[PDB]
């Protein structure tokens, strides 16, 4: 019979650090009770349980005044401390392509383009067959968060490898000044 | 040379 009390201090940034929203929220089991939204400037109750704290705290002026300023003393503060290794972290993606099925020419199988070991997550992937870009029937596994500040994705493509074809996976990512290409033939 | 923690208020006894 567990009881859980969460607490989250989040700083939201828009356009570098020109507009910032501090959000201090105290959560019960998984039910958020009270919160302080810099965009309001005072604690508000989200459910019944929080009302008490919503009052007791909104009464403490040294508290409110500290909270309202937290937007800089806290948010804009840490943002600038960890910017270099967080906001501007860049890791090039290593790309690998490989046929799913095992079948002689003329038989219809998946082509997988593994785009791994990259950060930020923001990335674009494209499929090419003999210079003509593919758009239809492209399945994507979506983006993966490896947990070690690294992303990964899989973009599959089905076809009927005919002799002489050249499938190429083209990737574009912030860590790259020029797209990375990987071909594959029959 | 860095990071601050955002202190927190205490709940209303009940």
């Amino acid at each position: 019979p567990r009881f859980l009390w969460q607490l989250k201090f989040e700083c939201h940034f828009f356009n570098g650090t020109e507009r910032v929203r501090l959000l201090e929220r105290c959560i019960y089991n998984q039910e958020e009770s009270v919160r302080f939204d810099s965009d309001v400037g005072e604690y508000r109750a989200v459910t019944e349980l929080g009302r008490p704290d919503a009052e007791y705290w909104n009464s403490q002026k040294d508290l409110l005044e500290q909270r309202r300023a937290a937007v800089d003393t806290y948010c804009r503060h840490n943002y600038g401390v960890g910017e270099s290794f967080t906001v501007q972290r860049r890791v090039e993606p290593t790309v690998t392509v490989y046929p799913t099925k095992t079948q002689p020419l003329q038989h219809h199988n998946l082509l997988v383009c593994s785009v791994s070991d990259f950060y930020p997550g923001n990335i674009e992937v494209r499929w090419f067959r003999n210079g003509k870009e593919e758009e239809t029937g492209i399945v994507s596994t979506g983006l993966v968060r490896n947990g070690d500040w690294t992303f990964q994705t899989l973009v599959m493509l089905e076809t009927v490898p005919q002799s002489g074809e050249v499938y190429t996976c083209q990737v574009e990512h912030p860590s790259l000044t020029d797209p990375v290409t990987v071909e594959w033939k029959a | 040379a860095g990071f601050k923690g955002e202190q927190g208020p205490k709940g209303e006894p009940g």
Binding site: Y28, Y79, G82 | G5, Q7
Partner: protein, 178 residues
């Protein structure tokens, strides 16, 4: 459009307390209670930053109480377990004889208490394994990662056994070369 989150949680009876920093989804660090110190997700971060750990311990304390307070005027409404979705992937594409890493994503669960085990050919693996404290998630549930280091082989096969109150029987996801 980045976000920094000082996510902290405390839970009874377990008395497991956690304090951590999150950025755009990944953890920057957490404060090791026992060691009363700071643990960086990436050693590089350390050369880059610093954090006075003693102050984290404070918040958790208030948290522990803040909980006890809420745990009461809720009419002891207990936490409703949420089953964890489990899955397995390699950090990078696999080639025989090419050392790689198996990832086990334990995602979307609660409470932040769980039991994980890596299995190589049926047997539990003990060396070459690491993990992460309970990571927060926008939906207020938790995320957990585990890592096994291996050397792809045809005979070898693995399993990430996960247990959690929200399940009847432990969860067992499989993985093997291709």
């Amino acid at each position: 459009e980045h976000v920094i989150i000082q996510a902290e949680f405390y839970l009874n009876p377990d008395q497991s307390g956690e304090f951590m920093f999150d950025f755009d989804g990944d953890e920057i660090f957490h404060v090791d209670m026992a060691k009363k110190e700071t643990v960086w997700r990436l050693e590089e971060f350390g050369r880059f930053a610093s954090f006075e750990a003693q102050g984290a311990l404070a918040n958790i304390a208030v948290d522990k109480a803040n909980l006890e307070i809420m745990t009461k005027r809720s009419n002891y409404t207990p936490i409703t377990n949420v089953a964890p979705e489990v899955t397995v992937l390699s950090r990078s594409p696999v080639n025989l004889g090419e050392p790689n890493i198996l990832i086990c994503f334990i995602d979307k669960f609660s409470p932040p208490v769980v039991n994980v085990t890596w299995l190589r050919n049926g047997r539990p693996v003990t060396e070459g394994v690491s993990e992460t404290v309970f990571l927060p998630r926008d939906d207020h549930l938790f995320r957990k990662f585990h890592y096994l280091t291996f050397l792809p082989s045809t005979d070898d096969f693995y399993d990430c056994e996960v247990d959690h109150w929200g399940l009847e029987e432990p969860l067992r996801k499989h993985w093997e070369f291709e």
